[PDB]
Amino acid sequence: AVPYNRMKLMIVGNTGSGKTTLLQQLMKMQSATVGIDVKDWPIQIRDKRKRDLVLNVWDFAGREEFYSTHPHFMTQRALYLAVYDLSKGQAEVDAMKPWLFNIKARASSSPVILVGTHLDVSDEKQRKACMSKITGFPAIRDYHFVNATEESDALAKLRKTIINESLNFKIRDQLVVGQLIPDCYVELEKIILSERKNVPIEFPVIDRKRLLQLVRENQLQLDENELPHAVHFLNESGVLLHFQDPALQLSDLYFVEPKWLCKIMAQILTVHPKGIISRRDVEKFLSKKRKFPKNYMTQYFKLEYLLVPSSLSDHRPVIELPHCENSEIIIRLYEMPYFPMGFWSRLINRLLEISPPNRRYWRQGIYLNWSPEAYCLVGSEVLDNHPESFLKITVPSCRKGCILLGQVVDHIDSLMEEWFPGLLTLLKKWALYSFNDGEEHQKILLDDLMKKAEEGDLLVNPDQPRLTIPISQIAPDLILADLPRNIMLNNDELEFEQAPEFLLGDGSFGSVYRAAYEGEEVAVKIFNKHTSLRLLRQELVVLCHLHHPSLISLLAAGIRPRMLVMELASKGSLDRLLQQDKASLTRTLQHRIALHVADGLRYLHSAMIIYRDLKPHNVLLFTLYPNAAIIAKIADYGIAQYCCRMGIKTSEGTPGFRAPEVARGNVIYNQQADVYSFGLLLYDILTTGGRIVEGLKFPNEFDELEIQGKLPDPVKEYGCAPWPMVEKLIKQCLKENPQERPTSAQVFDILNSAELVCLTRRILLPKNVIVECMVATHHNSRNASIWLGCGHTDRGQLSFLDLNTEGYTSEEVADSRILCLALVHLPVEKESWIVSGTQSGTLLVINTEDGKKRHTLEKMTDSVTCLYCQKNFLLVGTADGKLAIFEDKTVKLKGAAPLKILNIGNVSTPLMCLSESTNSTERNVMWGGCGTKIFSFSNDFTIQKLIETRTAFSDSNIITVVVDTALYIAKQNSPVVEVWDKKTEKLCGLIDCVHFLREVTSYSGRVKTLCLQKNTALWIGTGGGHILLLDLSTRRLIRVIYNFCNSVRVMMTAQLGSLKNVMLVLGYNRKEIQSCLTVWDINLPHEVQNLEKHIEVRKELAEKMRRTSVE
Ligand SMILES: CCNc1nc(Nc2cc(F)c(C(=O)N3CCOCC3)cc2OC)ncc1C(F)(F)F
Ligand SMILES: Nc1nc2c(ncn2[C@@H]2O[C@H](COP(=O)(O)OP(=O)(O)O)[C@@H](O)[C@H]2O)c(=O)[nH]1
């Protein structure tokens, strides 16, 4: 709680007025001030206990050219002077009036002194009357007309004033110098002083990390929670500058020397018509520790062939209207008292769109000429013999000019709705009509012409009814004549009813009743009585130009009852289907309704439009049939506003579905503040809308989640089944730093995957415990438990992961490394038993239910390499290839050998690829291999086929075999898989692995696992971490799957929750190993096709719509 006494002064001094001269004479070569020039000014008041008053003084430059960049520095908590000469007379105060008017809106809680200058040649008696009449214009406390350069002025009353304002001037009833601010704040300021000396001279900036390091490094005791509050406070007193604005993206940097930013305009001013200059090559001529000075972020200065408005000429150029007649041209008018500082800059910027041409943009008017058919001379014409100012648009009275005027007036009214609120009141529109051509123009304000037209669009001369002028060619914005002629109401062919029964939703400003239009069914959106035409145009700027097959469409629009006919969504909104038909949302439809909305948002954000209102009641469905082309459109663009790279300043949003910065409306967000609403939609789709009704209880609890943002784990509490690939969106596109969210194209891309609609679970075993052999549970009904054979320790462990609970309940039952496992499921006597094959060569046996039933079978001659489980025959393969046959009747027997060894090889030949077939169900076609030699056998235990494979990678032993109609053979470190036919016993195909991997990439394209789906496709798992979804048919590649693992160890097919079709996968993360277990849904090969055909369908739809729309 330390005292802090340092206020800021802003002498806004016009040119020639001697603001610098008065400051110099007050604070005890003066060519001009090129921009702001900040100084300090210490003083000690006469009172003994008077706080040390030091005024951070800004000697604001006053040439008109600089004005466009001024308002961004005029902030609150500052006493604005004003300086106008008196040798000019009553004209000088009139010329100073715009400055006071601009102060009146940029900061109106700031006291304003007002001081003349150069009283040596003044006539005070005249100007005193109008100066008193000045006291809309803010609280000009006290005029203090004073001398020029000598010392005969009591203007030091400023000090007096401010020390009164030390407690009179009250930001929220506080004291500007008496704020009991913590000592950590002042310590931050103290270290900022030295940081300004340490920071590069021509590159003043510090990052966040350095600030966070020095906070604790110098024992400040400052917490990270109040740290942004501390930054904001110091920015208020003006010792540093920080731009929280997400649209600017400069939230990372911190500016320590505010004396530098003020002069960047001056420097860049003097780095063919102006506003055209070469690339900003001067960005590297300085220190510039980046590819720009002080960071790469200079070019984001909202104050590359260059355009700058400040240096634009101030004379109306030599441009003549192609036509001249009262009948042939419309002219709109806006009556405004004072052009806000920085208007024409924003206007030129916004009107540098060329998609609604020889230009001629001067400092106070754009000009856009396509041809003698259509031009739009937006320009300032104060020549009215009146004090106020007129902004006038001029267009030719043909339909092309109407389509131009009706868009220019929307863009101007969006400028004046987002950036300049104070004007709208002061703003007063006008339309210029004339009955008999040649006579002068007669004006009528717009609020009256709108009603005169609503009554009837045949505007009558009040003097004599013999003259008639249609409201079309005088003001076609009001009667909706500037619209493509395909969309126009035809009320004869419309039969709506406003009755209660025929009602649908009620989306905020309006209602939507169903009706008939041409014979089909439609959704007539008649507006309320208290609704302005501006909202109609705000929706008809989006609904009549953009065409996309995931956005709602317009069938008509008319001004008589002010409706908007739109196509009907038969199946209902997303909310009314996420509260009733809960069980109709499968895992496919839940992804289609999130892909179509993402595509809609992509097309929106690609036309410079922000939606801002992505609720779950503005996602309409058309057909719940999971496999279609147009499932989910978007509707209710009631507050959708244009959004360039500059950003938006208003704050509209339904409480609970807003970005974190939208709620704190002080900052200016951008298009990427919408992806948060989409993430919230995705969180409300994943959990079947539980959050909706939970937020319905309390509006404060509904809005805290967009302010506090403590969202639960959706899989834990709400009960939803795990979707472990979309939970990487919901946990990514819900962040707090807007720069770190995925862009809309990048969240459409992540959602345009067949993996996401598949990876169905994902488990990570504990740190550095590894699996080498997996076996599922054949019961599939007791629970979802999958025993795993560990291999990390020298001894052998037998873990048992339980899939639904994720509890790794390992155990140590083996002495040596565990190599193979198998589950014998005999309903006879309820004998479900798991046996294993150790690297030592013993067949350990364990019962699932019995905690201790270790009936260790008679150990084989050598180690164990594989095992296989109607026919309940156990076929054990040793490293010698001495295949053994046990039996299921000896499950209780503790050590035995039921049948004889069918030895087919020696110790040199390792035998582990045993497999059966799904063709004809006859186990007699069991295949396999002993060493570098394939073989088969049957129940007769005879070798009915031995096919040696001795014919660089062609000299390796066998690993896996699968048999549906041919043979597939993998061998150790083989980029190929040697195919064989079971009829000719000859090698037919050679499916090269790395050849296929060449599209995604001493190549580690190994083959460490292999599986074969029933009759659809292969799953070839590569030791490099890829899953080759090879098509079984002839050669086609469905998809290669990667970027989730580093080495796939084992793969197999299992069953979960009494339903089949899951594909377990056990993978390495390569000495730190994180053994991972994905569980795919084996519908994946048919999915990659169905999804790709769907996408390719609607992309054709989107192109047929957009291309034809140009006509
Ligand atoms: C904001 C909703 N607007 C629309 N809504 C619809 N369709 C429906 C919306 C619904 F919600 C329900 C519904 O389930 N209801 C239950 C009772 O309460 C409301 C009606 C039924 C719909 O069509 C049959 N079509 C077009 C529109 C658009 F405005 F976009 F044109
Ligand atoms: N009329 C008049 N002008 C003065 C007097 N003393 C200084 N000036 C002018 O006032 C100017 C300073 O005005 P300033 O606010 O810095 O103008 P800016 O640089 O364009 O913003 C100097 O350039 C002087 O030429 C004076 O006694 N009478």
Residue numbers in the entry: 1329 to 1356, 1364 to 1470, 1478 to 1613, 1621 to 1652, 1665 to 1717, 1729 to 1796, 1806 to 2250, 2259 to 2340, ...
From the paper:
Leucine-rich repeat kinase 2 (LRRK2) is a highly pursued drug target for Parkinson’s disease (PD), which is the second most common neurodegenerative disease projected to affect 17.5 million people by 20401. LRRK2 is a 286-kDa protein containing seven domains (ARM, ANK, LRR, ROC, COR, KIN, and WD40) with kinase and GTPase activities. Autosomal dominant LRRK2 mutations with higher kinase activity are leading genetic causes of both familial and sporadic late-onset PD cases. Here we report high-resolution cryo-EM structures of LRRK2 in complex with a panel of small molecules, including two type I (LRRK2-IN-1 and GNE-7915) and three type II inhibitors (rebastinib, ponatinib, and GZD-824).
For type I inhibitors, we designed an LRRK2RCKW construct with M1732R mutation (LRRK2RCKWm) based on the following observations and rationales. Second, the binding of type I inhibitors could lead to a kinase-closed active-like conformation with flexible N-terminal ARM-ANK-LRR domains, which did not show interaction with the rest of the protein upon activation. We determined LRRK2RCKWm structures with LRRK2-IN-1 and GNE-7915 at overall resolutions of 3.5 and 3.8 Å, respectively. In our structures, type I inhibitors display well-resolved cryo-EM densities, which allow the analyses of protein–inhibitor interactions in atomic details and comparison with ATP binding in the active state. Despite small differences in the overall structures, LRRK2 KIN domains with type I inhibitors and ATP are almost identical with RMSD < 0.5 Å. LRRK2 with type 1 inhibitors bound show conformational differences compared to the active LRRK2cent protomer in the Rab29–LRRK2 complex with a small rotational movement of ROC-COR domains. The differences likely result from the tetramerization of LRRK2 in the Rab29–LRRK2 complex, where ROC-COR domains play a key role in mediating LRRK2 oligomerization.
